[PDB]
Design a protein around this ligand. Structure first.
Ligand SMILES: CCCCCCCCCCCCCCCCCC(=O)OC[C@H](CO[C@@H]1O[C@H](CO)[C@H](O)[C@H](O)[C@H]1O)OC(=O)CCCCCCCCCCCCCCCCC
Ligand SMILES: CC(C)CCC[C@@H](C)[C@H]1CC[C@H]2[C@@H]3CC=C4C[C@@H](OC(=O)CCC(=O)O)CC[C@]4(C)[C@H]3CC[C@]12C
Lengths: 17, 122, 36, 390
C-alpha cells in the first residue's frame, strides 16, 4: 500500500512549478 | 415482383404462410429484402378502397394487384364444379362457398353467411 | 380483375405469370420492387 | 547489451535468424536518455493544427466506414467480412487510442490542458481505461525501463529461479498455476495478453494505493470507464442482442488489444536485450536505447495508427509531439545508427516470440523455449533429488 505516494508527490512538485 | 417490359403486381394471400413462403423464396435470392420484410394483415376494406381509386395517382404503369387463394379450397371448389356435370380444371376468382337453405337469422332478419372455407361452411 | 388458375404445383395467369410450385416459382413471360 | 561487441557478420546472421533488421552496437554506462534530445532541431517540437486534426479524424473515418459497412448488412454478412470490418474498426480505434495516450502525457495540445484532458478521457472511455492510472503506470514504466523485479507495467519476463520455486511450491507441473502459465505463454493468446494488463488497472479499486491529495481526481478517472460500461454497453445489447454485441463491440475490442499487446511485446523484447536488476549492472541510457526495438509499418498503417510504433523518438524526448515522431527518427539514425535496433512485420518474428523466446534465463541472459526449459529444470530437480537421496 502507498505504492504511488512518492511518484505522485514528485510529479506534482515538478509539473506545477 | 418485377417482370419484363416494366411490369409489377401486388398480391394478397388469404393464408399468411403463402407470403411467408414467398419471402422465404426471396431469402433464396435476396437476403436484404428478406430481412426488410414485415407481415401485415388488413381486411378487404382498404384494398377494395384502393381498387376504387385512380391507380395512377399512387403510380401505375403496369402494377396489377391480384389475389392468391390457397390451392386446398380451390381444389375443393373445382371438385364441386365438376361434380355438377361439366368437368374442367381451371377456376376464376377466389372460391366462395354457400349452401342452399342455410341463412343465419338475427333478432330481426335472416342474413346469408358466406364461407370461404368449405370446412367451416359444412 | 380476375386471374386464371390451374391445379396441376398449380399454375396461375394474370390478365407476370405466377407459378405456385408446391415454395413458389415467380415466373416471367425477380421481386426487386416496392411501393412509391 | 547481451550480444555486444563482436564482428558484425555474426550479429547480421543473428538478425536474419530472428527477423531483425539490425543489432545494436556497444553502449557505455553513465548516460541519461534525455541527453540525445539536444541533437534534434528546434523546429521538431512545433505545433500545428492540420496534422493533429488529421491524426484524430482519419482513424475516426476508418471506424465510421467500418460501422456504416456493417450496419448496412448488420448480421447477414459472412464470417470473414465480419472479420474484415472488426479489424478495420479496431485499427481505427488503436489510432484514436494513441491520440489519447498522447494527451495523457500532456504533449498533444499543451495550449488547452483542460480540453486535451477531456479528450483523452473521452477517447479512453470506450476501451474501459482510466486516464490517470494509465499515466501513472506509463511514467512508472519509463522510470524502470527493462529493470528486473521493478517494471511490472511493461512486459516483465518470467525468470528461471522463480519458476523452479513455483515448481516446488505446487508439487509438480500439474497444478493450475503451471498449466495456466504454459497455456498463456505458448499459444497465440499471448498476442492478447494485454487483456490481463487491463485487469491490473483498477488497483483493486482501492484508493489506498495513491496520494490523498489526488483522491477526487482518481475516482473521476474511474468514472468515465464505469459510466460507459453502465450506460452504453446495456443500450447496445438492448438494441442488438447477444450476437449484435459480439459484433459491434467485442471484436474491435479484441483487435485493439491485439495491436496494443504486439506493439509493446515487440518493442521491448528481444534475445539480444538482457534484463538486469539494478545494482547488478543497470543503467538508464543503456537499458533505454540499447535494450529497445523499433518496428516498421506500411505508410497506410503508419498514417492510421498515428506513428504508433515510434517509441524511442519520444523516449529521448518525452515532450516530442506526434506528427514529428518519424522525422525525429530520421535524425537519430544519423547519430546513434550503430546502436539502434530495428525490425519489421513478419509472422516469423511472432512465431519465434510464441515458440522460441518463451522463458528468460539470467545465466545466458537470453530467451529459451519453454518445453526445453521445463524438461531441463525437471532434470535439475532430478539433480537436487540425487543430492537428497542421502
Ligand atoms: C494503440 C495505440 C498504442 C499507443 C500506446 C502504446 C503504449 C504501449 C505500452 C502499453 C503497455 C501495455 C503493456 C501490456 C502488458 O504488460 O501486457 C503483458 C502482461 C504480462 O506482463 C507481465 O506479466 C506478468 C505475469 O503475469 C506479471 O503480471 C507482470 O506484472 C506483468 O507486467 O499481460 C498479462 O498480464 C498476461 C497475463 C494474464 C493472463 C492472460 C489471460 C488472457 C485472457 C484470455 C484472453 C481472451 C481470449 C483471447
Ligand atoms: C461486464 C462488462 C461487460 C462491463 C465492464 C466490467 C468491468 C468494469 C469489471 C469487470 C471485471 C472487473 C475487475 C475484476 C477483478 C478485480 C479485482 C477486485 O479486487 C480484488 O480482488 C482485490 C485484490 C485481492 O483480492 O487480492 C476488484 C477490482 C477488479 C480489477 C475488477 C474491476 C472492475 C472490472 C474491470
Amino acid at each position: 500500500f502507498g505504492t504511488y505516494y512518492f511518484l505522485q508527490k514528485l510529479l506534482s512538485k515538478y509539473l506545477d512549478v | 415482383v418485377a417482370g419484363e417490359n416494366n411490369t409489377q403486381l401486388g398480391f394478397f394471400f388469404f393464408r399468411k404462410e403463402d407470403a411467408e413462403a414467398l419471402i422465404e423464396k426471396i431469402r433464396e435470392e435476396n437476403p436484404r429484402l428478406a430481412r426488410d420484410s414485415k407481415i401485415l394483415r388488413v381486411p378487404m376494406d382498404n384494398v377494395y378502397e384502393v381498387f376504387t381509386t385512380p391507380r395512377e395517382q399512387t403510380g401505375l404503369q403496369g402494377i396489377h394487384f391480384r389475389f392468391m387463394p390457397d390451392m386446398k379450397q380451390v381444389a375443393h371448389a373445382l371438385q364441386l364444379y365438376k361434380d355438377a356435370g361439366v368437368p374442367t380444371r381451371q377456376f376464376i376468382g377466389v372460391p366462395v362457398f354457400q349452401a342452399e337453405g342455410l341463412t343465419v337469422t338475427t333478432r330481426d332478419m335472416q342474413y346469408v353467411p358466406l364461407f370461404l372455407c368449405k370446412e367451416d361452411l359444412d | 380483375x380476375x386471374x386464371x388458375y390451374x391445379x396441376x404445383x398449380x399454375x396461375x395467369x394474370x390478365x407476370x405469370x405466377x407459378x405456385x410450385x408446391x415454395x413458389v416459382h415467380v415466373f416471367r413471360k425477380x421481386x426487386x420492387x416496392x411501393x412509391x | 547489451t547481451s550480444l555486444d561487441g563482436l564482428p558484425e557478420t555474426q550479429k547480421y546472421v543473428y538478425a536474419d535468424e530472428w527477423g531483425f533488421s539490425r543489432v545494436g552496437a556497444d553502449f557505455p554506462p553513465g548516460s541519461h536518455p534525455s541527453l540525445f534530445s539536444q541533437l534534434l532541431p528546434q523546429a521538431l517540437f512545433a505545433f500545428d493544427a492540420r496534422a493533429a486534426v488529421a491524426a484524430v479524424a482519419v482513424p475516426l473515418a476508418a471506424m465510421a466506414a467500418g460501422y456504416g459497412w456493417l450496419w448496412y448488412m448488420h448480421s447477414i454478412a459472412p464470417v470473414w467480412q465480419q472479420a474484415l470490418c472488426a479489424a478495420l474498426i479496431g485499427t481505427g480505434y488503436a489510432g484514436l487510442f494513441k491520440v489519447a495516450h498522447e494527451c495523457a502525457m500532456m504533449r498533444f495540445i499543451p495550449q488547452m490542458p483542460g480540453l486535451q484532458a477531456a479528450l483523452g478521457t473521452l477517447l479512453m472511455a470506450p476501451a474501459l481505461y482510466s486516464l490517470p492510472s494509465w499515466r501513472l503506470h506509463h511514467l512508472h514504466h519509463l522510470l524502470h525501463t527493462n529493470m528486473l523485479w521493478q517494471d511490472v507495467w511493461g512486459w516483465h519476463p518470467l525468470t528461471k529461479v522463480e519458476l523452479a520455486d513455483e515448481m516446488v511450491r505446487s508439487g509438480g507441473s500439474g497444478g493450475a498455476a503451471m498449466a495456466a502459465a504454459r497455456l498463456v505463454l505458448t499459444t497465440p493468446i499471448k498476442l492478447f495478453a494485454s487483456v490481463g494488463h487491463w485487469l491490473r488497472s483498477w488497483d483493486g479499486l482501492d484508493l489506498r494505493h495513491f496520494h490523498p491529495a489526488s483522491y477526487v481526481e482518481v475516482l473521476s478517472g474511474w468514472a468515465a470507464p464505469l459510466a460507459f460500461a453502465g450506460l452504453v454497453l446495456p443500450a447496445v445489447v438492448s438494441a442488438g442482442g447477444l450476437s449484435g454485441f459480439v459484433s459491434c463491440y467485442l471484436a474491435p475490442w479484441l483487435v485493439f488489444h491485439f495491436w496494443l499487446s504486439v506493439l509493446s511485446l515487440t518493442a521491448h523484447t528481444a534475445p539480444h536485450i538482457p534484463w538486469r536488476a539494478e545494482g547488478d549492472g543497470w543503467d538508464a541510457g543503456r537499458a533505454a536505447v540499447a535494450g529497445t526495438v523499433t518496428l516498421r509499418l506500411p505508410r497506410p498503417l503508419e498514417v492510421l495508427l498515428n506513428n504508433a510504433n515510434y517509441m524511442l523518438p519520444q523516449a529521448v524526448a518525452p515532450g516530442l509531439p506526434m506528427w514529428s515522431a518519424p522525422a525525429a527518427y530520421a535524425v537519430l539514425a544519423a547519430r546513434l545508427g550503430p546502436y539502434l535496433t530495428e525490425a519489421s512485420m513478419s509472422l516469423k518474428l511472432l512465431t519465434n516470440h510464441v515458440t522460441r523466446w518463451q522463458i528468460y534465463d539470467e545465466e545466458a541472459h537470453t530467451y529459451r523455449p519453454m518445453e526445453e526449459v521445463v524438461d531441463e529444470i525437471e532434470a535439475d530437480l532430478q539433480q537436487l533429488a540425487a543430492a537428497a537421496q542421502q
